[PDB]
Amino acid sequence: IVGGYTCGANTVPYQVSLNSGYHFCGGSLINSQWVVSAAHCYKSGIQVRLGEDNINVVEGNEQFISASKSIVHPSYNSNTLNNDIMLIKLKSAASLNSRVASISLPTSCASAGTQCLISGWGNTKSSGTSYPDVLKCLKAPILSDSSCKSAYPGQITSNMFCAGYLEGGKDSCQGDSGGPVVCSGKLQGIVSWGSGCAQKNKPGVYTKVCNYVSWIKQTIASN
Numbered sequence: 001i002v003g004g005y006t007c008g009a010n011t012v013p014y015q016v017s018l019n020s021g022y023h024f025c026g027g028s029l030i031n032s033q034w035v036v037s038a039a040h041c042y043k044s045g046i047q048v049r050l051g052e053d054n055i056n057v058v059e060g061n062e063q064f065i066s067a068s069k070s071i072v073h074p075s076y077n078s079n080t081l082n083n084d085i086m087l088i089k090l091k092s093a094a095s096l097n098s099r100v101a102s103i104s105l106p107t108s109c110a111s112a113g114t115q116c117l118i119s120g121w122g123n124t125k126s127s128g129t130s131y132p133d134v135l136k137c138l139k140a141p142i143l144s145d146s147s148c149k150s151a152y153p154g155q156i157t158s159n160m161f162c163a164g165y166l167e168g169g170k171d172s173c174q175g176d177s178g179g180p181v182v183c184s185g186k187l188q189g190i191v192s193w194g195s196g197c198a199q200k201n202k203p204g205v206y207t208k209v210c211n212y213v214s215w216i217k218q219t220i221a222s223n
């Protein structure tokens with residue numbers, strides 16, 4: 001997250017770190033046994049880390065649970081990033097509490113202008129590299145579909161939305177992908193892609209979770 005703020009320990013209780021020896025992506029806990037992330041975060045050997053603040057220090061609220069299965073969306077296209085969503089099942093259910101909690105799936109799609117909370121452990125620089133150890137946060141509005149398409153001609157599908165600031169300076173970045181975009185207490189987005197980070201006229205692009213609720217529910221019900 002570039003141009004954000006330190007969230008505070010365990011203030012984003014649905015935020016997970018995906019670890020394969022190191023943090024590589026975010027995710028969102030949607031019930032005691034399932035995490036939503038980005039398909040482009042797929043790999044083998046995922047351990048889900050819940051209750052994290054500093055990802056380099058054991059601070060006492062962590063739960064580390066290996067994945068039993070991963071399900072990339074049937075129609076994920078890694079070239080266009082259309083349908084950039086995956087489900088990860090935990091081998092055992094998390095113990096839910098005030099610091100490790102699920103986030104609800106949307107009932108309705110969110111509209112341009114709605115404020116959202118974007119979070120992660122990704123790079124905090126637009127130019128160069130600095131990875132924080134503690135979780136960062138950014139409040140950002142959803143942008144109009146028209147603004148989004150004008151920023152990324154030919155690239156925005158019906159399964160994507162933009163959020164952030166056309167002036168740049170405040171955005172998600174590498175290492176944040178797969179993590180949450182939460183608006184009015186619902187998971188509306190997954191941190192997906194953009195050109196660089198925090199660049200003018202290149203806001204973040206997010207997987208539009210409301211389009212996937214039926215797939216998510218059906219997949220969980222049979223796996």
Ligand SMILES: *C(=O)c1ccc(NC(=N)N)cc1
Nearest residue numbers: 173174175177192193194204
């Ligand atoms: C994921 O790691 C990711 C998502 C989005 C961006 N770019 C922007 N938000 N502009 C970079 C990396």
Ligand SMILES: [Ca+2]
Nearest residue numbers: 054057058059
């Ligand atoms: Ca920790």
